[PDB]
């Protein structure tokens, strides 16, 4: 749909409450999401796959890091997805271990050496 009503669909999905309950959160969400609708950094899905690999090594599951390569194959096999970078970066941002230094290793280029 249109993105502005889709934000409202989000705020009804995650909360068990309707929009009539609390509207401070939706205002603060508008403050966050607005002016961030365009990736101003490089969108290489290759780096994002190699970050899930580092993440699954950090959780000590090498079998999961090696099935991840077959699942990363399946995206290539269909190829119907448009930004492969965004959805895997989103699922990586909400990473969780079912059971330190992370900014020191690889991140996407800032574009301060290019016109944004």
């Amino acid at each position: 749909k249109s993105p502005n009503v889709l934000l409202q669909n989000l705020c009804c999905r995650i909360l068990g409450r309707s929009e009539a309950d609390v509207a401070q959160q939706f205002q603060y969400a508008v403050r966050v999401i607005g002016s961030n609708f365009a990736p101003t950094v490089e969108r290489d899905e290759f780096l994002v796959a190699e970050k899930i690999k580092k993440e699954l090594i950090r959780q000590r599951r090498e079998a999961d890091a090696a099935l991840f390569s077959e699942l990363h194959r399946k995206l290539h096999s269909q190829g119907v997805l448009k930004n492969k970078w965004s959805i895997l970066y989103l699922l990586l941002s909400l990473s969780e271990d079912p059971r330190s230094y992370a900014t020191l290793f690889a991140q996407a280029l800032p574009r301060d050496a290019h016109s944004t």
Binding site: F46, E50, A66, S69, E70, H72, R73, H76, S77
Partner: protein, 161 residues
């Protein structure tokens, strides 16, 4: 000639099989090409050169009962580790149906060390049986690296059964 054919050839020399325009030449040296790009290939084929020694050894000694039950339990672990190496290769096969990823150096760099440790391990465990064989696996767990210590102790649990 284009690089994408060479990528297909390189994806077979990891197993220990000649490619098509890259083939094995001089057994105790690496694969030889039939300016920078030509020099890159010799470094990627060394993983398969390491693979040859482990694979030819756990092929032959698995059928031996003159090498004992211990030695065969070592062969189980060696072959079990070789399968896990071919999984990646199958993925890389299907993922292409001109591109390099530094000709897959970033993929190969972590299995390269998992091959080098085994390349030492097959020769320290050569021509031994039983507890004498067990002591030869016992030597390499005196390491500070967590990657190596995680590698050897899996084999050691199987050999001492």
């Amino acid at each position: 000639i284009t690089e994408a054919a060479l990528v297909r050839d390189i994806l077979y020399v990891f197993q220990g099989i000649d490619g098509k325009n890259i083939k094995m030449n001089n057994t105790e040296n690496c694969y030889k090409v039939e300016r920078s790009l030509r020099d890159t290939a010799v470094r990627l084929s060394e993983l398969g050169w390491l693979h040859n020694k482990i694979r030819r050894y756990t092929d032959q000694r698995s059928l031996d009962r003159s090498f004992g039950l211990v030695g065969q339990s070592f062969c189980a672990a060696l072959h079990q580790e070789l399968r896990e190496y071919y999984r990646l290769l199958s993925v890389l096969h299907s993922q292409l149906q001109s591109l390099t990823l530094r000709r897959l150096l970033v993929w190969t760099y972590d299995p390269k060390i998992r091959l080098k440790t085994l390349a030492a391990l097959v020769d320290h465990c050569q021509g031994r049986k039983g507890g004498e064989l067990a002591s030869a696996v016992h030597a390499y767990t005196k390491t500070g690296d967590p990657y190596m210590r995680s590698l050897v102790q899996h084999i050691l649990s199987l050999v001492s059964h």
